[PDB]
Amino acid sequence: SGFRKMAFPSGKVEGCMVQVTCGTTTLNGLWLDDTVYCPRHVICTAEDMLNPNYEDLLIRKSNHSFLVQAGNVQLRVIGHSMQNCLLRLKVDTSNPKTPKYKFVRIQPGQTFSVLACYNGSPSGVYQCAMRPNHTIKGSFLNGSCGSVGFNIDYDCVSFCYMHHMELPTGVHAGTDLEGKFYGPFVDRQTAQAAGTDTTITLNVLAWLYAAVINGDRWFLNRFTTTLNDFNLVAMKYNYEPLTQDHVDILGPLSAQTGIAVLDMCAALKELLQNGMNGRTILGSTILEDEFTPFDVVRQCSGVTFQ
Numbered sequence: 508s509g510f511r512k513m514a515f516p517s518g519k520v521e522g523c524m525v526q527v528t529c530g531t532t533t534l535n536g537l538w539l540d541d542t543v544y545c546p547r548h549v550i551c552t553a554e555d556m557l558n559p560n561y562e563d564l565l566i567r568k569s570n571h572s573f574l575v576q577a578g579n580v581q582l583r584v585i586g587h588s589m590q591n592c593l594l595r596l597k598v599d600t601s602n603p604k605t606p607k608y609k610f611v612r613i614q615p616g617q618t619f620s621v622l623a624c625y626n627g628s629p630s631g632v633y634q635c636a637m638r639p640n641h642t643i644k645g646s647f648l649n650g651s652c653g654s655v656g657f658n659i660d661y662d663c664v665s666f667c668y669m670h671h672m673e674l675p676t677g678v679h680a681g682t683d684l685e686g687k688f689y690g691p692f693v694d695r696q697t698a699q700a701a702g703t704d705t706t707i708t709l710n711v712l713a714w715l716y717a718a719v720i721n722g723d724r725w726f727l728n729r730f731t732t733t734l735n736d737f738n739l740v741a742m743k744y745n746y747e748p749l750t751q752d753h754v755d756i757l758g759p760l761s762a763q764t765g766i767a768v769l770d771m772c773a774a775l776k777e778l779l780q781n782g783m784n785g786r787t788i789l790g791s792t793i794l795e796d797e798f799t800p801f802d803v804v805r806q807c808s809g810v811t812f813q
């Protein structure tokens with residue numbers, strides 16, 4: 508029993524973190540086989556960052572403009588290219604600790620673990636949700652760029668995020684491991700704001716199913732609702748509309764609890780309209796939206812506390 512925001516064991520990823528220096532800028536890189544991936548703004552000076560032309564900045568560098576350090580071992584750069592907002596540095600050694608891996612671009616609402624690193628050295632692990640507005644609420648200081656987000660399936664690390672910047676509201680933006688940003692953001696120290704955000708309805712619902720699987724039913728009710736009548740309540744409270752696809756995804760959790768999806772939607776509508784009345788759900792006083800249906804099935808027991 509219990510329910511916590513759980514990150515994946517970070518071991519396979521720790522063995523891939525290195526340090527990349529260029530000029531006076533130092534950040535982290537990701538060392539898979541004979542390539543190190545890192546944000547391209549590593550090549551910027553402080554004044555380059557306000558309006559950089561990376562194509563022009565990069566052609567002014569050679570292989571030995573880049574210092575790559577793996578623990579105490581220096582790695583020699585033997586090639587370099589720009590892929591979108593990343594640099595790919597080819598090195599003379601292939602990482603013996605390279606795990607089975609993929610590069611994946613995640614969808615909004617999905618979760619992943621972040622390994623926060625400084626100077627190529629892991630320092631912390633926590634779980635994040637890609638928000639609807641394509642930011643994450645991370646915890647990043649100076650020197651954190653090149654930290655990666657990932658999921659682990661079996662033995663395969665699915666890298667899905669690399670960190671680049673912090674927005675004025677204190678939230679974070681970055682790219683997939685092909686260098687394409689999530690959201691409309693660019694790696695420039697310009698005026699850039701997060702779009703308005705929304706609550707991830709599919710995740711709130713999945714977490715109510717988690718609460719029932721762990722033996723709590725106090726928030727349920729005798730009513731039901733149509734998809735359309737729920738979405739009028741969703742609009743009022745700044746929740747994403749629920750689609751038939753979301754209902755289908757919640758199918759297995761509905762089967763393990765015997766609570767029909769639209770019956771749970773009626774429960775949520777009631778929670779939104781009436782509040783929680785000083786009570787908690789899985790230890791929380793608010794409706795939690797950073798757990799996917801996959802997160803719930805992963806963490807919860809397959810047997811309901813009936």
Ligand SMILES: *C(=O)[C@H](C[C@@H]1CCNC1=O)NC(=O)[C@H](CC(C)C)NC(=O)[C@@H](NC(=O)c1cc2ccccc2[nH]1)C(C)C
Nearest residue numbers: 548556647648649650651652671672673694695697698699
């Ligand atoms: C990576 O090393 C570093 C990590 C941030 C430092 C603090 N917390 C972080 O996550 N990222 C950077 O330094 C960015 C460099 C590239 C984008 C070229 N720069 C920033 O993150 C600054 N970036 C902004 O984008 C910014 C400032 C600003 C002011 C008004 C309106 C919009 C707006 N965007 C940060 C302020 C540190």
